[PDB]
Symmetry: D3
């Protein structure tokens, strides 16, 4: 019972996503399509990477990940299809559901979208998608998200051999983007968690415990060099005490974050991604 | 062929809902997940209750209702799992599809979310959700909507015995919220029906016929003590005559409501929930 | 394995769509419901027609199309159910998936919604939907999108004979709307493609090649008689050269369109549908 | 002690008005320039009319009114200068300042701006402003508000003869506009939102009311835009609505039926703007 | 050389203020009307108070202050006219203009508008304005700002006797309001956003500071609305924050602790408005 | 009959400007203060420059221009006072008011505000304002617009000697800014949106045009922000665009190429703001 998890920049105000799904079913009958998100900022590769990087451990083995923002649609560019190694705490009841390696496939424009996927998970082999068996002989130039991602993803869900979609790629041929690094820790606001107004940073758990920082530690987190927040590190929001109170926590992705307890922190003060972050103890 | 109807405050701008669905499928293969809404105002329990209270009669028997806003995520709080009694006019073709009792299960934070569910439908037994068989041994503090609702809901859809998720609860142990009552009838605007701009009140059919009010009766409905609307009670919008004309009707949930015929009433004049309502004849 | 593609004006902020889906499953167990869009402007028939007109070739044969905006809900009006002729370049891998005729069914309010469907595709026979076997004996006046579209659509997906839903209609009895025609070509902006900000016009490929216009031709496209854009006709966005540069192209629906390469054209300058269009060479 | 009362659409965000004022002082030294308003909606002649039609009784005899919105600036269109007749119950302390006839001059573009001035005050002699003694020989094309209104207004204030500004006009040569009508239950329109209070003015006059048997203390239903309803008695002032926030129907200082909330804004919360239909039923 | 300083809530988008000015000139010829502000939030008495409480030392002796927001217009409510005592370190060049006592008159609605004028300047004689020699016999009900403030202000400016405007009041007859308190770590509130700069004024006075041992050059943490934090030393001016955009804590020209960014706006980016709680901790 | 023309960034929503005016009257009795503008964008020196560079020819000889935006208030930064040379075809009726040389004084912060005044009018003697005879001995740190501009402007208007305000400056001591350049097809920038009409001013001058062989009645293509295109002939005024709403390219009263719609706003509908690139091609 095959699954395609589908992430795109196609939006939710027209038939575009539905066209893709129609084909997915046409090709892989009995397929279940799980919508990740279709609301991402178009062409914002680094935003899209964030929505797909942590998915594998939550999905059954065999799940195909169709992930696409395709600003170079209609060009010589071709999509890349990749079987990752490690799905990567396990998710689920009990001690979790351990996922076998080489058990997930990403297919995506070769435009950097998979950058964090490949490094957090690794990959066995990557292939350029060119065979007319998994893509159209005459692709609609403007709709590669359908022609060069959705359509072949469904072939791959129906058991089509990855190694036959086209030629094999070298690591150097796989486009990557580059994240700002983390340097007293300096970082950046990665995202606002809608609809809660929570604030996410690029500082990982692993960066804290490397500076002698664990739960309960009193910290200062400064935004934009003008907003000096102060609070103890806590596992969750309610630990901040009263409603509205600032909380400092590690989010479900393993990253230092701020919020208010049952109140929005970002929205009322128009705090957005990009603001810079300084962490002190 | 199990169904999970899923309602949350997780939104539609990231991978959160997808993570949950991935697990649901992992646990209950062949499960179909029906999205109710994920756009509710976070932490607004009474808004979430409104989206889930009328669902059972529309769904096949055996449907599990996973409904969650979890501001106390990461705390001692635990979710409650409940088998309701009456699913409650029947919905469907002909005279409708009669639903057997004890045929639906709700699982939700024990924070008042199910208040109207339990009173409109009743319940056979309620249980605290604690067994590591339906929830993780080490839950992510900030994501109880996944760990303590989504994950066990899928076990319950796969046939896991309700009585084994944890200890049985007493009625007093089930958190409830309290609605403003209805008192010439006085009430309150409960919701604006997007995207139509229709206005919903807490005055039920049953409150009208208890004051000698049936179809065709000329009424006055005043909002905020400054907007005196006048119209006959009618079954639907077009009965108001011309487009734009005010209509007074009972909505599909059985509640007195106002609108314009093929025009928005609320949006142009920024009429929101909370406004108070006076009904006269 | 039956499919219902579902398009409505019911929105995504309440349980309405879910109620419908619940019934669909109740009636046609094992049915897969593919959401097209539920965000259309309510009562805007011509907008809804645009989201459903190009679907058939993307879906498996047998797919039932449940498409509904129902401002005359609760009136004498009844829905129309139609088996189209031609599904209509084929979509998919290779040379595409050829679709047999008479292989798709639309069901919809008889209010003009299907106007472009029937003319672009044709139809074998149309029927008024009245039988209490596919609709309720006592319909909720305000919710015909559920009672007179969703419910019977699921019967039709479960194999119920189209000719038995009610009486057969004459062409004249099928409500239609009328599009502005295309006249140096004059036309109109049909839609803004969210979230990209691309601009769509009513000028078809077929209108260009009828004026000696093919790829590479230098054109001028004027909006609102005040915005004289100039660019060569190109297959896709990146052909415009640098990012931000204007591109003139045929979209995936076969219509002259404008945009910027990896930049929004409409949003920053508040360009909306309705603006008039003049095309020169 | 010459006075020019200055109304324009030039705004409050550049030196336009100040250029004009500098010339007024240049031409007429010792002049006092009283700002009427400079924030009117651009080119909205009927809106400007309301800001200048009630002025004369509040001002000293001989005051010159310089009133301009000049969308046809740079064309053959010229300004007109007019001695009005009646200053029209007086304003001021006691029983008020009695104003003699023919004591005020309006100078404006001949584009209808004065339609209502002439209608309520009548006039005596109107002249086209063409003389290079009171306007520039080579006027800046975009700045006729200055060239054809401000400058000449100052010569007039200095005592320059009205009859010498140019040729005398006939009534048919004075461009006029048509007020929105009141139909008769009364139907009219919202003429203006009174900022910053959010009060709502209609074109419905006291005389239309008393002509439909509607007097003080009486209950009306007013509907805006064919759907938004309000009910209240006709009262003299806002506080008569009782509680803060309550709805009030009154006659404004200009004689027109108006709607408001008491020490709160009615227009803004419902996004009400000029132009909406008004239906009044008793 | 009579002068009336005019503060109202009448706005900048109609002829209201100009009607008032025309009468001032009518009643007191040669008067100069100095606009203070006309854009205050409607009916917000405590906001108006701040725009008129610091004025006297900047103005010539004998200047009359006409200050009005009149939400009770058309009622029994009357205006009060007051000769203040102390003009209160002087403003102007050198060591400043020394202002004699009892040299300024305020006329306003008796609705508390003058609460802070009387508190900081004290007063000598206050009178109720009822005489038909300085107000109209039949006042327009909606326009008391004109009928009961503007008109009488002009007679006063012309030298009309203060004691003759009506009966003399006692302190208990002068309506007053209560300032938002400062609790004591200090807690107060934002009183105003200083446009167009986006600076933020608090009700916390220099004296509250020096009373908590807080002086120049010292580090404070200020929290707005119980969550939005800022840290900086107390400095005399904006540039002392260093780089453009940096946060500054200072005492404004009125003596109140304030927050700002240096040549950049603090309020607008975070949508900060008057009314927010302020917590200052050292 | 002394006159001070007053331009500041102080705004229209408090008593700041009125404090300043009170002192002007205090120091120079009988002075007339002409408001230029007080609504300029805060700290935007080049925007202020445009509101004060065209003024002298419209004003009487001897008028003092008090022009200030003072982001460095409270520092060592001082103001400068300057007698300009050329008042620069005259404004006014007939062939206009001929203005003698050296007849205007500007006083402003030495922060570049006068860059364009000095460039177009030249100057004769510029002085640093330091004397405690024309400024305060203990200036309020946040209010230099008042302490270092308003107060001294008044002494100057009263006839106080310019050379005595402080030491004489050299050209190199007068801070200046750089105008946005015009590159050459011409590329420039939008300098301002002309409110409330929504007209669009560019930095492209008449001389840049006639230097590229571009004259009246000729077709141009103008592109804003590298993507938004407009086409029209160069005409003298808005109506020359024909129909209401139509696009017009013209030279404004200041000599700069500008874009507009005829009796309709161009900027607002497309959200166009100052700063956008402008490309003009013929
Ligand atoms: N104006 C545009 C410029 C570049 N790429 C676009 C544009 N509009 C849509 N796209 C891309 O086309 C893809 C469809 O194949 C979308 O995923 C999207 O990234
Ligand atoms: N800032 C926050 C404070 C309290 N609860 C939150 C916050 N953000 C998300 N949540 C809750 O966490 C749940 C995830 O388990 C969501 O359903 C939501 O209700
Ligand atoms: N205020 C309204 C007036 C007319 N039709 C409405 C209104 N609100 C909802 N509807 C219609 O009712 C249908 C539900 O059956 C929706 O598809 C919608 O088109
Ligand atoms: N874009 C424009 C179109 C038509 N008239 C305008 C425009 N901008 C300014 N004006 C007019 O120019 C006059 C100044 O002479 C103003 O009164 C105003 O009405
Ligand atoms: N809607 C209103 C309610 C109460 N007072 C008002 C209203 N509109 C204007 N006013 C008051 O009328 C006064 C003019 O006399 C103004 O100062 C103002 O305070
Ligand atoms: N937040 C601020 C930063 C820098 N300068 C300011 C600020 N607020 C006001 N000013 C300046 O103070 C001057 C008044 O002396 C004004 O001209 C203005 O430029
Ligand atoms: Cl790409
Ligand atoms: Cl909770
Ligand atoms: Cl319909
Ligand atoms: Cl005046
Ligand atoms: Cl005109
Ligand atoms: Cl003044
Ligand atoms: Cl009052
Ligand atoms: Cl003046
Ligand atoms: Cl400065």
């Amino acid at each position: 019972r095959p699954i395609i998890a589908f992430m795109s920049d196609l939006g939710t105000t027209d038939d575009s996503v539905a066209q893709c799904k129609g084909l997915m079913h046409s090709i892989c009958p009995g397929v279940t399509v799980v919508d990740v998100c279709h609301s991402m900022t178009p062409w914002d590769v680094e935003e899209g990477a964030r929505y797909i990087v942590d998915l594998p451990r939550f999905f059954p083995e065999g799940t195909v990940f169709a992930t696409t923002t395709y600003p170079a649609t209609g060009t010589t560019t071709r999509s890349v299809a990749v079987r990752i190694r490690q799905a990567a705490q396990w998710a689920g009841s009990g001690d979790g559901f351990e996922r076998a390696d080489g058990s997930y496939i990403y297919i995506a424009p070769n435009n950097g979208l998979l950058t964090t996927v490949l490094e957090e998970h690794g990959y066995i082999e990557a292939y350029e998608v060119t065979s007319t068996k998994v893509i159209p002989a005459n692709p609609e130039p403007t709709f590669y998200s359908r022609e060069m991602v959705a359509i072949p993803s469904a072939h791959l869900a129906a058991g089509f051999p990855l190694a036959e979609v086209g030629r094999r790629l070298d690591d150097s041929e796989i486009v990557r983007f580059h994240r700002p690094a983390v340097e007293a820790l300096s970082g950046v606001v990665t995202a606002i968690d809608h609809p809660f107004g929570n604030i996410w940073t690029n500082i990982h758990r692993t960066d804290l415990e490397k500076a002698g920082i664990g739960q309960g530690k009193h910290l200062k987190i400064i935004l934009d060099d003008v907003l000096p927040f102060e609070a103890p590190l806590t596992p969750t929001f309610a630990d901040a005490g009263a409603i509205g109170n600032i909380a400092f926590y590690l989010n479900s992705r393993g990253y230092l974050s701020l919020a208010r307890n049952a109140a929005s922190l970002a929205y009322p003060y128009n705090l957005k991604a990009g603001l810079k972050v300084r962490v002190e103890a």
